[PDB]
Design a protein around this nucleic acid. Sequence first.
RNA 1: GAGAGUGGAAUUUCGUGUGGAGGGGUGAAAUCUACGGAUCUACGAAGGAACGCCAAAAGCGAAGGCAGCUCUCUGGGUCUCUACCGACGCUGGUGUGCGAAAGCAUGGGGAGCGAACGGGAUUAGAUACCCUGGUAGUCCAUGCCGUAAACGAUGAGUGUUCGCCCUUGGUCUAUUCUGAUCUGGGGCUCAGCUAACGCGUUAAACACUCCGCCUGGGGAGUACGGUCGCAAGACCAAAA
RNA 2: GCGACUGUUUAUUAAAAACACAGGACUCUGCUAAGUGGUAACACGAUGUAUAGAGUCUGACACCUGCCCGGUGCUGGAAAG
Lengths: 177, 26, 100, 101, 75
Amino acid sequence: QNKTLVAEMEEKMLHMDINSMIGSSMPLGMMRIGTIIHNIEMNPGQGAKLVRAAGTNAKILKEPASGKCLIKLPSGDTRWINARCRATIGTVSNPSHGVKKLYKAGQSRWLGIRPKVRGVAMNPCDHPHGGGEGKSKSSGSRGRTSVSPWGKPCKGGYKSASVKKKKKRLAAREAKM
Amino acid sequence: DSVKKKRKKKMNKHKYRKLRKKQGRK
Amino acid sequence: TYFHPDNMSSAEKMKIELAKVREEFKMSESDCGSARVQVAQLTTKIKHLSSVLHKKDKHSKKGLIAMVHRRKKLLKYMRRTDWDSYCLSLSKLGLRDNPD
Amino acid sequence: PLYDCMLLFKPIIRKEGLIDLVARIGKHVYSKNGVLTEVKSFGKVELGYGIKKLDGRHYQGQLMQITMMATPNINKELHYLNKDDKLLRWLLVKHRDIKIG
Amino acid sequence: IRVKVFSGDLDKALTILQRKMQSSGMERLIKAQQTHHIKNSEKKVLARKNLERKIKSIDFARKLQSILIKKVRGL
RNA sequence: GAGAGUGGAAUUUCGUGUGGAGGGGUGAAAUCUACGGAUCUACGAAGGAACGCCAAAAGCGAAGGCAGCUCUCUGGGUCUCUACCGACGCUGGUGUGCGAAAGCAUGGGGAGCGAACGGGAUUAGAUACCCUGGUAGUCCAUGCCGUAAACGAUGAGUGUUCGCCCUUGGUCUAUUCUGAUCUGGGGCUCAGCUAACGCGUUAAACACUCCGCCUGGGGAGUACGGUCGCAAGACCAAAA
RNA sequence: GCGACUGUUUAUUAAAAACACAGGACUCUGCUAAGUGGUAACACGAUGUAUAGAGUCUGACACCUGCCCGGUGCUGGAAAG
Ligand SMILES: [K+]
Ligand SMILES: [K+]
Ligand SMILES: [K+]
Ligand SMILES: [K+]
Ligand SMILES: [K+]
Ligand SMILES: [K+]
Ligand SMILES: [K+]
Ligand SMILES: [K+]
Ligand SMILES: [K+]
Ligand SMILES: [K+]
Ligand SMILES: [K+]
Ligand SMILES: [K+]
Ligand SMILES: [K+]
Ligand SMILES: [K+]
Ligand SMILES: [K+]
Ligand SMILES: [K+]
Ligand SMILES: [Mg+2]
Ligand SMILES: [Mg+2]
Ligand SMILES: [Mg+2]
Ligand SMILES: [Mg+2]
Ligand SMILES: [Mg+2]
Ligand SMILES: [Mg+2]
Ligand SMILES: [Mg+2]
Ligand SMILES: [Mg+2]
Ligand SMILES: [Mg+2]
Ligand SMILES: [Mg+2]
Ligand SMILES: [Mg+2]
Ligand SMILES: [Mg+2]
Ligand SMILES: [Mg+2]
Ligand SMILES: [Mg+2]
Ligand SMILES: [Mg+2]
Ligand SMILES: [Mg+2]
Ligand SMILES: [Mg+2]
Ligand SMILES: [Mg+2]
Ligand SMILES: [Mg+2]
Ligand SMILES: [Mg+2]
Ligand SMILES: [Mg+2]
Ligand SMILES: [Mg+2]
Ligand SMILES: [Mg+2]
Ligand SMILES: [Mg+2]
Ligand SMILES: [Mg+2]
Ligand SMILES: [Mg+2]
Ligand SMILES: [Mg+2]
């Protein structure tokens, strides 16, 4: 019952390698270049964190150098990940998840999403975009970009200076690697 | 049909394509 | 082990299978070209090709449609000439009767 | 059908690695109900250009040939040799009536 | 294609290199290298014209060879 | 023909040594690019697209079309036979299918090229031709569209008609080097045909079968209507 | 004419063409994620992981969406000063 199953794959294993052990997990340092992977740990033994959503996958770009591997993430970023971290061979299931579309407002409410009111529809006490008579974006030729309810911009590539500092530190540490 | 006779059809077709893109766009 | 059918290509297997079908349907002992023999061989080829041919392979599908129309012509010949062999082929190969 | 499996090893691979890969392909042929009729070594050959791998560039190689009577699916089932680090090249060809010397 | 220079003779080595350029077909391929794209519809016309000039040159060579061979034989 | 793998050259970009002043481009220039170090030179990396030589009046396919190599699956063709079978054939309205390229839809990909567009020039002007950037597109997967100077401007088929030179793929005979017979592809030609140019056993010759189409030019492949298409449009198609 | 639609709204003079909506697009976020609230711990985001989370505008569907980065913002940049 079980020994027949562990012997049937032993005649499969000797004519097979990493790139078609789909669903199996091993450390990244045991893998090859160009292996398509998902469910990558950030810390060894903590659990999978990185490539988890439906249809997503990552790609190994470099061999373990100084104990770390270079990996291309679904965002297009590349990160150096510790070679002892685990990952699962293949892509995440349900790859047609991102193309299915709803047809009515009730389906959003079934998922637990409540309606969103635009900032321009409010009053100045509610949103920075509020105010004005008739339809109006509550700024002008000497205003600012479109902003959050808390006044922070949300166009033109804005991010907070803390985020810029942290990402610059990460990029500078990864340039020496 | 020579090139000289083809040119009359060429001009008729160009004017018709122009008129159809001007009228039927609206 | 060397002569096992697992070690044979698909074309060799089709050759052996068509020789068997031709043996099954012959009128004389050297008969290989009568209408009912050609109908049985075409039916076997049509059934193999309708399953193995890729959807994008249009050039082979034109030949498969040619096999279909050849089988119609041979069945039409047998329906007016040899009614017994016509009923033999329709019963044994499971084909419909379409005199129209 | 009858096939010739050509195997161009890297020149640094030892006797044991060559035997290991040839025996792994051979046990793969046996498991699919096949016969191995012939195994031969062409020794060290000089290449026409420098074959470049992740190791570097190689101008020599060890040439092996296994002749097998095997399933038609075996060239597809041998695609693990594309990810094999002992190999420079591999090629499966239908067996020809030509004397190779 | 590399040619050694023997006894400092540049002209002999250059003649040898030119001969090996010509006889290996590499000079013909270098001369045929294009600087712009040519469509297949224009490649057909070029091949037709090249065949026509080859036919004319073969006819001319045949006439000269027949005249010279018939004259040299002493008839 | 479809599927699955794989190869190298070159272009572009990036990196690392060496090196230092231009490079690129034109009729001439300039935009551009380069001292934040280019072009150039060696090694390396990434990526896409197309497959040099072979190689062409060659080959294959109904046509459109098809080019690196390996394997799988598969359509058609040719030759030989003292094998079978026994007129089962040809053509084909209405129909059905296939059908360059551009275009459309969804998702990928994006080196090079490049509608649109920005700039640099030319010019009287220059919504162009030239230069420099360059989006869609060109590529893949799955659907749509259904049109081309889709051309041999030559419908499909059958029978017959003096020869010569080549060539593709077979077979037979050979008498050491060639003949014969099929099979397609070319060149030339006796006749015959042709308004003329020319065609000429792959006819535009001598005859025949079946289909499509024409009936002075323009208006016009336009109007109207129907069907089809997501659209772009397509098909049938007048009259004054 | 307006809004695609079913819905929602000024309890107590306004139910609508207003709001929402499915759909569309842009920007940010590599996970101790961004973002939000808090002096902080911490919590939500989320026992989620870029086919996910957040902010903004537009608002079914069909056809489309041209020019301008000079201005206000946001954003990238080796040096000199
Ligand atoms: K809203
Ligand atoms: K407002
Ligand atoms: K309030
Ligand atoms: K308002
Ligand atoms: K108001
Ligand atoms: K015309
Ligand atoms: K052919
Ligand atoms: K054929
Ligand atoms: K041939
Ligand atoms: K002639
Ligand atoms: K004839
Ligand atoms: K509307
Ligand atoms: K109401
Ligand atoms: K409201
Ligand atoms: K501006
Ligand atoms: K600005
Ligand atoms: Mg209000
Ligand atoms: Mg305020
Ligand atoms: Mg107003
Ligand atoms: Mg005419
Ligand atoms: Mg196209
Ligand atoms: Mg796209
Ligand atoms: Mg201009
Ligand atoms: Mg230009
Ligand atoms: Mg360009
Ligand atoms: Mg037409
Ligand atoms: Mg054509
Ligand atoms: Mg021959
Ligand atoms: Mg001939
Ligand atoms: Mg005539
Ligand atoms: Mg016809
Ligand atoms: Mg038309
Ligand atoms: Mg109409
Ligand atoms: Mg009114
Ligand atoms: Mg309403
Ligand atoms: Mg109701
Ligand atoms: Mg209502
Ligand atoms: Mg009230
Ligand atoms: Mg009321
Ligand atoms: Mg929405
Ligand atoms: Mg939480
Ligand atoms: Mg609105
Ligand atoms: Mg606009």
